Amino acid sequence: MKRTYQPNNRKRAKTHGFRARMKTKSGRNILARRRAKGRHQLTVSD
Amino acid sequence: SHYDILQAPVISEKAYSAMERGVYSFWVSPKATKTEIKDAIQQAFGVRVIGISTMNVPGKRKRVGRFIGQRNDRKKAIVRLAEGQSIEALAGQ
RNA sequence: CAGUCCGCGGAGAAGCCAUACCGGAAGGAGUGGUGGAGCCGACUGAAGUGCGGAUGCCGGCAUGAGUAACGAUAAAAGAAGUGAGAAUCUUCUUCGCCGUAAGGACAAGGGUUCCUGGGGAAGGGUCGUCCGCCCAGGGAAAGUCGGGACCUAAGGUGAGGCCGAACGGCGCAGCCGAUGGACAGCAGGUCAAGAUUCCUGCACCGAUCAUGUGGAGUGAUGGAGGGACGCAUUACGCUAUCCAAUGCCAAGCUAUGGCUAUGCUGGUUGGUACGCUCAAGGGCGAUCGGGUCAGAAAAUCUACCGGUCUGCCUCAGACGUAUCGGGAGCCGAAGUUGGAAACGCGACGGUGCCAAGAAAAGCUUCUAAACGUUGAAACAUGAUUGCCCGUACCGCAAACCGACACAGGUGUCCGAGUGUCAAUGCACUAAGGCGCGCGAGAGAACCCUCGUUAAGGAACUUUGCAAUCUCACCCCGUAACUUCGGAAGAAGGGGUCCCCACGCUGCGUGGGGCGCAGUGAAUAGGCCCAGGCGACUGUUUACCAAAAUCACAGCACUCUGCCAACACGAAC
RNA sequence: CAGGUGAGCUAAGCAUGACCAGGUUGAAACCCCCGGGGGCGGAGGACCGAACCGGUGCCUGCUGAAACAGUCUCGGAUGAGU
RNA sequence: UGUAGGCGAACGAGCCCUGAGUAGGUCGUUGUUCGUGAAACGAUGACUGAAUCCGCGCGGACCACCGCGCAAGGCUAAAUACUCCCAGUGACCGAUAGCGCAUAGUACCGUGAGGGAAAGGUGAAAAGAACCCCGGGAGGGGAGUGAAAGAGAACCUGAAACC
RNA sequence: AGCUGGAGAUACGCUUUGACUCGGGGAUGUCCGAAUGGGGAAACCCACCUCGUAAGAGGUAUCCGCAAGGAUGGGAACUCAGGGAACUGAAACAUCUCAGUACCUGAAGGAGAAGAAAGAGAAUUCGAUUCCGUUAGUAGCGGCGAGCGAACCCGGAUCAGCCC
Ligand SMILES: [Mg+2]
Ligand SMILES: [Mg+2]
Ligand SMILES: [Mg+2]
Ligand SMILES: [Mg+2]
Ligand SMILES: [Mg+2]
Ligand SMILES: [Mg+2]
Ligand SMILES: [Mg+2]
Ligand SMILES: [Mg+2]
Ligand SMILES: [Mg+2]
Ligand SMILES: [Mg+2]
Ligand SMILES: [Mg+2]
Ligand SMILES: [Mg+2]
Ligand SMILES: [Mg+2]
Ligand SMILES: [Mg+2]
Ligand SMILES: [Mg+2]
Ligand SMILES: [Mg+2]
Ligand SMILES: [Mg+2]
Ligand SMILES: [Mg+2]
Ligand SMILES: [Mg+2]
Ligand SMILES: [Mg+2]
Ligand SMILES: [Mg+2]
Ligand SMILES: [Mg+2]
Ligand SMILES: [Mg+2]
Ligand SMILES: [Mg+2]
Ligand SMILES: [Mg+2]
Ligand SMILES: [Mg+2]
Ligand SMILES: [Mg+2]
Ligand SMILES: [Mg+2]
Ligand SMILES: [Mg+2]
Ligand SMILES: [Mg+2]
Ligand SMILES: [Mg+2]
Ligand SMILES: [Mg+2]
Ligand SMILES: [Mg+2]
Ligand SMILES: [Mg+2]
Ligand SMILES: [Mg+2]
Ligand SMILES: [Mg+2]
Ligand SMILES: [Mg+2]
Ligand SMILES: [Mg+2]
Ligand SMILES: [Mg+2]
Ligand SMILES: [Mg+2]
Ligand SMILES: [Mg+2]
Ligand SMILES: [Mg+2]
Ligand SMILES: [Mg+2]
Ligand SMILES: [Mg+2]
Ligand SMILES: [Mg+2]
Ligand SMILES: [Mg+2]
Ligand SMILES: [Mg+2]
Ligand SMILES: [Mg+2]
Ligand SMILES: [Mg+2]
Ligand SMILES: [Mg+2]
Ligand SMILES: [Mg+2]
Ligand SMILES: [Mg+2]
Ligand SMILES: [Mg+2]
Ligand SMILES: [Mg+2]
Ligand SMILES: [Mg+2]
Ligand SMILES: [Mg+2]
Ligand SMILES: [Mg+2]
Ligand SMILES: [Mg+2]
Ligand SMILES: [Mg+2]
Ligand SMILES: [Mg+2]
Ligand SMILES: [Mg+2]
Ligand SMILES: [Mg+2]
Ligand SMILES: [Mg+2]
Ligand SMILES: [Mg+2]
Ligand SMILES: [Mg+2]
Ligand SMILES: [Mg+2]
Ligand SMILES: [Mg+2]
Ligand SMILES: [Mg+2]
Ligand SMILES: [Mg+2]
Ligand SMILES: [Mg+2]
Ligand SMILES: [Mg+2]
Ligand SMILES: [Mg+2]
Ligand SMILES: [Mg+2]
Ligand SMILES: [Mg+2]
Ligand SMILES: [Mg+2]
Ligand SMILES: [Mg+2]
Ligand SMILES: [Mg+2]
Ligand SMILES: [Mg+2]
Ligand SMILES: [Mg+2]
Ligand SMILES: [Mg+2]
Ligand SMILES: [Mg+2]
Ligand SMILES: [Mg+2]
Ligand SMILES: [Mg+2]
Ligand SMILES: [Mg+2]
Ligand SMILES: [Mg+2]
Ligand SMILES: [Mg+2]
Ligand SMILES: [Mg+2]
Ligand SMILES: [Mg+2]
Ligand SMILES: [Mg+2]
Ligand SMILES: [Mg+2]
Ligand SMILES: [Mg+2]
Ligand SMILES: [Mg+2]
Ligand SMILES: [Mg+2]
Ligand SMILES: [Mg+2]
Chain F: nucleotides below 7 Å from protein CB are 30, 33-34, 40-43, 55-56, 73-76, 104-106
Spatial distance from the CA of A24 to the C1' of C161 (Å): 23
**Cβ partners under 8 Å of residue B35, min gap 6:** none
**Cβ partners under 8 Å of residue B33, min gap 6:** none
Chain D: nucleotides below 7 Å from protein CB are 3-10, 66, 68-69
Tally of domains in chain A: 1
Q: Is the CB of B62 under 7 A from strand C?
A: yes
**Cβ partners under 8 Å of residue B73, min gap 6:** B30, B56, B57, B58, B59
**Burial environment of residue B34 by CB neighbours within 10 A (0 to 12, 13 to 18, 19 or more):** middle
3-state secondary structure B6-53: EEEECCCHHHHHHHCCCEEEEEECCCCCHHHHHHHHHHHCCCCEEEEE
Q: Which residue range forms the structural domain that includes residue A42?
A: 1-46
Q: Is the CB of A11 under 7 A from strand E?
A: no
A31 nearest nucleotide via C1' and CA = E113
A17 nearest nucleotide via C1' and CA = F41
Half-sphere exposure of A5 (CA within 13 A, CB side): 3
